[PDB]
């Protein structure tokens, strides 16, 4: 259905241990496809998914250039932000940015993104209009004023409405066999007695892509949101994801509980019960 391209930039200062490290990773949906690391022996934009490997040297050279330039810009920016917050030269700090575009099934721009954080806190973001900024504090207002004066929002809008969506559409075609394939979860319910009158029912989902999934437990048809333990969806390492949901139930009452599974790769939602 809908898709996204997103780049994730992390720059971290490390006083006494060289210049700040810059890492950029690119994703289409839940699939990483490139990386760049300023600490690499020979920093280069590198492929991380098979379908991107066909791009020619111009792609790799241009993206490498952009990332080397960005490395320096983020270093200058970290120096600036330290000043905006009256911070000493002794501490380590982090500047993060995530940017990119979302498209619908027809490939048209749904919306664009350009958001930044400093030391894990929201700093500045491009608004959905792709024309104005939201600054989190008086420090970010300095960046906002600079970016307004230089019409940076206009640059982002041009990139997001052009380059970004054009490349996303290209990636989606080149990687269609995986990027446009939803793999349904393999599911089962396990049962583990806790004591003489309580047992855990755990509903498993394995091998699914993309990561978006809904796993719920119902008791007599009512959602057990408060009583359900849901682990974070986790990567298996083969592109797929895993998740479980568990509920503690009175012994003998197991049949009043059903696990419901919703996922894009399923022909229809699943309703599972424990099978003794």
């Amino acid at each position: 259905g809908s898709h996204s391209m997103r780049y994730f930039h992390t720059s971290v200062s490390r006083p006494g241990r060289g210049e700040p490290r810059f890492i950029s990773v690119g994703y289409v949906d839940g699939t990483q496809f490139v990386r760049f690391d300023s600490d690499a022996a020979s920093p280069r934009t590198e492929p991380r998914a098979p379908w991107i490997e066909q791009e020619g040297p111009e792609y790799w050279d241009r993206n490498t250039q952009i990332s080397k330039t960005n490395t320096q810009t983020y270093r200058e920016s970290l120096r600036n932000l330290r000043g905006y917050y009256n911070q000493s030269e002794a501490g380590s700090h982090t500047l993060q940015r995530m940017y990119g575009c979302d498209v619908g099934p027809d490939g048209r721009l749904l919306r664009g993104h350009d958001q930044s954080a400093y030391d894990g806190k929201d700093y500045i973001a491009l608004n959905e209009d792709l024309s104005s900024w939201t600054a989190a504090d008086t420090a970010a207002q300095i960046t906002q004023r600079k970016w307004e004066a230089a019409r940076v929002a206009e640059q982002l809008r041009a990139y997001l409405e052009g380059t970004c969506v054009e490349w996303l559409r290209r990636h989606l075609e080149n990687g269609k066999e995986t990027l446009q394939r939803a793999d349904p979860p393999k599911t089962h319910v396990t049962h583990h007695p806790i004591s003489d009158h309580e047992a855990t029912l755990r509903c498993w989902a394995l091998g699914f892509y993309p990561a978006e999934i809904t796993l719920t437990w119902q008791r007599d048809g009512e959602d057990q949101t408060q009583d359900t333990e849901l682990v974070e969806t986790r990567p298996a390492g083969d592109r797929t994801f895993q998740k479980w949901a568990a509920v503690v139930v009175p012994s003998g009452e197991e049949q009043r509980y059903t696990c419901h599974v919703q996922h894009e790769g399923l022909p229809k939602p699943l309703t599972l019960r424990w099978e003794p």
Partner: peptide
């Protein structure tokens, strides 16, 4: 491809 970003 990526964007060449501006200084904060």
């Amino acid at each position: 491809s990526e964007l060449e970003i501006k200084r904060y």
